[PDB]
């Protein structure tokens, strides 16, 4: 009976599927029938004669007079540096115009982002103007401008990601989602910069750029002017853009209402930038005249979410945003502020003032937190953990904690938060990857009393950014 | 979504080259 | 048993002790205002403190024991008592030394 | 609210009325209620599932695999069975279960797990195997 | 073969708790007043062995290196038995032998006695300094800190070539607070 195959097929893979064709020619022709349950190709690695097969599968079964079939995903990445262009050459020749690609992962680095524009126009086969999300690990090139036309190309195309793995030499309604992620050593500019300056993105709920130089010719986007075109954005991550600034990403916060809601924030300077702080002077523009008012809080009071890693934060500014209420305390649920070398903590005798994190009153303000990441956060010493133990009281929704790649925080520490913690029923994960100082026979003591549901102790993990997972930063 | 791995490039006398100025 | 468990029970006991026996909280501060008044104007004091085994012994037993026996896991502690002690005092690890009555050792 | 049950075959069980409605066609076709395309034994499987996941809400099942372990030719009864006469929540099970079963398994696998002969003309096997190679791993 | 071992050591065992000459368990005797004195040691005439069983000495002189660490633990065993209340820590005991073989002078020892009991007789000519053997390391890895131990007898070990479940090459450390120690001193006799 044709109803149950549908049902069978697609708990299996396409793959699975098409080799499950030679078990006998009556099932070859079960299996071959039901076009529709191919709804994904994931192709990548293929070298060209393979990849010729396969379009010649497209031209035999799928190439039905009737307009019906789509698939939902197609990654295609070349086996080979030259087979690269002749897979897309063929691709953008010989799909057929009756069945619609919704979604391409077009994985192909050596790929000049003009080649992939010309092999769309010239090829014709114009799904490209009719496809839901396009995927483009690519090699940039600067002159041309036409990473940009793939947009005005493919009017239908709502999550776009640009990987420009190398480099070489209006309205936008559609688009929900983009991705910016760049070779630091290699992309010497910020390719989307005058698209994103001049032009308007008003459905995008995520934007997500990593890698890009900031160019220092044009105060405007140092100033993130280009960013007030984009409203409604739900999230927001940036990250390693070396010449960017919290600095000057607090002066927009400070001075226009830019968003309505952020659920979530994550912004990742690389350098040392100088001692950033809250900057809560309200001028007025003369004693007779009201001050400007300070959109800090209606711009921040939405985040679910804020990640600052390595971003030069003071200790102070943390709290002044606790203490102002411009972070609402009971939205946010997850804070990252690892990496921060302007955080100390009350425990220290040896800083400026405004360095130190009270996080006595900031676990007060947004007690009921559940995910905290202090990684690679040296001041984190043994002394200044005290201050976590006696402060466990207004952090007990807490429970996945990020603190490794410390050189410092010794297993001492660790044990008595986890018995402090354990007065409130462990905590349900623990990360320490990559510190010196959590001693063996500590963290198996950790397990046999089970204090921690799941605890991570790789020592010999030398890094904390799993790309995708962790950080958009490329490789 | 993937990060890369390398691969040795390779560089010979192309018939562009040979035509360029 | 896990050392780091008990440490912070030995970092507190042997600050009971040198709360019990002032006359160490006297010797820090003594060593710090020497060592701040050869800074005010232009001979320096190490951070260093002698501790009778014997005033150790009438405090805790147990603890003086543990520091003749097991000194790689009692000495630490309590050198970081000390060390906290005088960064109580007003305005670098601090380290101990010892005096008297050894016995068999 | 209670109902009785009319096997493809003639015998009768009886259930609380939303283990009938595991079958979802039965408010259409139509205390009694006919059901004439099911077997005796696959019947009686039905409702014993069905009688277990009288605890289940729907919008694989480590019950549902064992449960269904079961000769390859009455398994497939089974399968065939539920469809006439709808019944989708043990159908989804079997469904699953038969791709479980399948998952590993090569296509000389398949021929004696399903009971069935390799139906090719095997230089045309060769061919379309010629032809199916970029769905390799 | 480990049963095969411990039935040597429950032999061995037996030969402590057992051996008996005129109504005095000589061996219980020894082992409990040495034990009051704290030397962790027992001496041991070979003619009482071999008149108690003479398989055991057999065992004992084909191949003395694997069977003198089994009579020192059997020797442990018994010191727990006799001086402690178990279902209310000792240090592994040496055993001293004392023998009334035929003497092999100094200069005749050569290829054929490797590995046997030989006693001999000369002038202890020089006596070195005391040195630390290990009998029992704590051992970690350097890259896991996977930690294990070795249990060693001084009668002839080495730290493990690799990883016992990348982790590199050759990782093991000994953690020197854990580990246990023996003195060992060198002489020469003429
Ligand atoms: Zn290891």
């Known amino acids: 009976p044709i109803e149950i195959l549908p049902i069978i097929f697609q708990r299996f893979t396409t793959k699975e599927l098409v080799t499950l064709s030679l078990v006998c020619n009556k099932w070859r022709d079960k299996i071959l029938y039901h076009l529709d349950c191919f709804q994904e190709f994931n192709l990548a690695p293929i070298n060209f004669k393979n990849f010729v097969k396969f379009m010649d599968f497209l031209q035999q079964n799928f190439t ?70 396009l995927s483009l690990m690519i090699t940039y090139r600067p002159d041309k401008q036409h990473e940009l036309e793939i947009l005005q190309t493919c009017p239908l195309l709502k999550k776009i990601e640009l990987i420009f793995v190398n480099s070489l030499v209006v309205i936008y309604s559609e688009l929900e989602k983009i991705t910016l992620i760049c070779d630091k050593k290699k992309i010497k500019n910020f390719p989307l910069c005058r698209a994103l300056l001049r032009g308007q993105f008003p459905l995008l709920q995520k934007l997500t750029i990593t890698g890009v130089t900031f160019p220092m010719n044009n105060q405007d986007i140092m100033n993130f002017q280009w960013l007030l075109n984009f409203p409604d954005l739900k999230e927001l991550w940036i990250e390693d853009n070396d010449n960017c600034e919290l600095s000057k990403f607090l002066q927009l916060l400070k001075f226009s209402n830019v968003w309505k809601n952020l659920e979530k924030l994550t912004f990742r300077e690389n350098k040392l930038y100088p001692i950033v702080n809250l900057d809560e002077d309200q001028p007025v523009t003369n004693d007779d005249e009201v001050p400007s008012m300070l959109f800090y809080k209606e711009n921040l009071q939405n985040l679910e979410k804020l990640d600052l890693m390595g971003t030069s934060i003071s200790g102070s500014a943390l709290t002044r945003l606790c203490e102002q209420e411009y972070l609402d305390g009971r939205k946010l649920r997850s804070l990252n502020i690892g990496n921060c070398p302007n955080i100390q903590f009350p425990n220290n005798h040896a800083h400026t003032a405004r360095m130190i994190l009270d996080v006595n009153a900031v676990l007060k303000r947004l007690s009921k937190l559940e995910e905290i990441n202090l990684s690679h956060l040296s001041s984190l010493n043994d002394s200044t953990m005290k201050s976590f133990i006696i402060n466990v009281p207004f952090l007990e929704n807490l429970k996945r904690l990020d603190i490794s790649h410390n050189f410092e ?30 001693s063996h026979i500590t963290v198996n003591m950790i397990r046999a009393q089970n204090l921690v549901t799941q605890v991570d102790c790789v020592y010999e993990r030398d890094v904390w950014r799993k790309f995708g997972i962790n950080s958009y930063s490329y490789s | 979504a993937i990060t890369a791995r390398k691969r040795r490039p390779q560089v010979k006398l192309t018939a562009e080259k040979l035509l360029s100025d | 048993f896990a050392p780091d468990a008990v440490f912070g029970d030995r970092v507190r006991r042997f600050q009971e002790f040198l709360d019990t026996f002032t006359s160490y909280r006297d010797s820090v501060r003594s060593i710090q205002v020497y060592n701040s008044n050869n800074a005010a104007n232009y001979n320096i004091l190490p951070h260093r403190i002698i501790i009778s085994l014997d005033d150790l012994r009438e405090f805790d037993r147990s603890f003086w024991s543990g520091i003749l026996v097991e000194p790689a896991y009692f000495i630490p502690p309590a050198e970081k008592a000390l060390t906290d002690l005088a960064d109580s005092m007003d305005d670098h690890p601090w380290k101990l030394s010892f005096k008297g009555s050894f016995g068999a050792h | 609210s209670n109902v009785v049950l009319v096997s493809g075959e003639g015998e009768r069980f009886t259930v609380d009325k939303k283990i009938a409605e595991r079958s979802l ?10 059901v004439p395309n099911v077997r005796s034994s696959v019947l009686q499987k039905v409702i014993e599932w069905a009688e277990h996941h009288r605890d289940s809400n729907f ?13 390859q030719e009455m398994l497939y009864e089974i399968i065939l069975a539920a469809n006439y006469l709808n019944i989708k929540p043990l159908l989804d099970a079997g469904c699953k279960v038969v791709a479980e079963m399948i998952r590993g398994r090569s296509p000389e696998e398949i021929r004696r797990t399903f009971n069935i002969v390799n139906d090719f003309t095997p230089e045309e096997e060769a061919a379309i195997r010629r032809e199916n190679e970029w769905a390799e791993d | 073969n480990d049963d095969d071992n411990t039935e040597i050591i429950k032999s061995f065992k037996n030969f402590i708790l057992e051996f008996r000459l005129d109504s005095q368990f000589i061996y219980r005797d020894q082992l409990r007043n040495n034990i009051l004195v704290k030397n962790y040691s027992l001496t041991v005439n070979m003619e009482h062995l071999i008149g108690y069983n003479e398989d055991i000495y057999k065992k004992l002189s084909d191949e003395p290196s694997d069977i003198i660490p089994l009579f020192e633990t059997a020797i442990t065993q018994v010191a727990k038995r006799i001086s402690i209340l ?73 730290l493990p070539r690799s990883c016992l479940s990348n982790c590199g090459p050759d990782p093991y450390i000994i953690i020197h607070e854990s580990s246990k120690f023996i003195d060992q001193q060198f002489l020469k006799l003429q």
Request: proline share 4%; with cysteine; glycine share 2%.
């Open chain 1, 64 to 133: 039905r007079t009737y307009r019906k079939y789509i698939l939902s995903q197609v990654k295609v990445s070349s086996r080979i540096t030259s087979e690269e262009l002749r897979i897309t050459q063929l691709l953008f020749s010989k799909m057929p115009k009756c069945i619609n690609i919704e979604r391409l992962i077009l994985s192909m680095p050596t790929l000049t982002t003009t080649q992939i524009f010309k092999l769309m126009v010239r090829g014709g086969t114009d799904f490209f103007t009719r496809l839901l999300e």
């Open chain 1, 409 to 438: 925080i010794t297993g001492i520490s660790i044990y008595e938060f986890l018995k402090k913690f354990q007065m409130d029923q462990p905590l349900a994960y623990l990360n320490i990857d990559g510190c010196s100082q959590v």
């Open chain 4, 25 to 34: 066609l039965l408010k259409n076709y139509l205390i009694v209620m006919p």
């Open chain 4, 59 to 71: 919008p694989v099942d480590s019950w549902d695999r064992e449960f269904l372990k079961v000769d």
């Open chain 5, 86 to 158: 178990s279902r209310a820590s000792l240090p592994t005991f040496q055993l001293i032998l004392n023998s009334n073989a035929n003497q092999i002078p100094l200069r005749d020892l050569d290829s054929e006695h490797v590995s046997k009991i030989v006693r001999l007789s000369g002038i202890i000519i020089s006596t070195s300094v005391l040195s630390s053997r290990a009998t029992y390391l704590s051992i970690m890895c350097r890259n896991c800190r996977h930690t294990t131990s070795i249990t060693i007898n001084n009668f002839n070990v080495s």
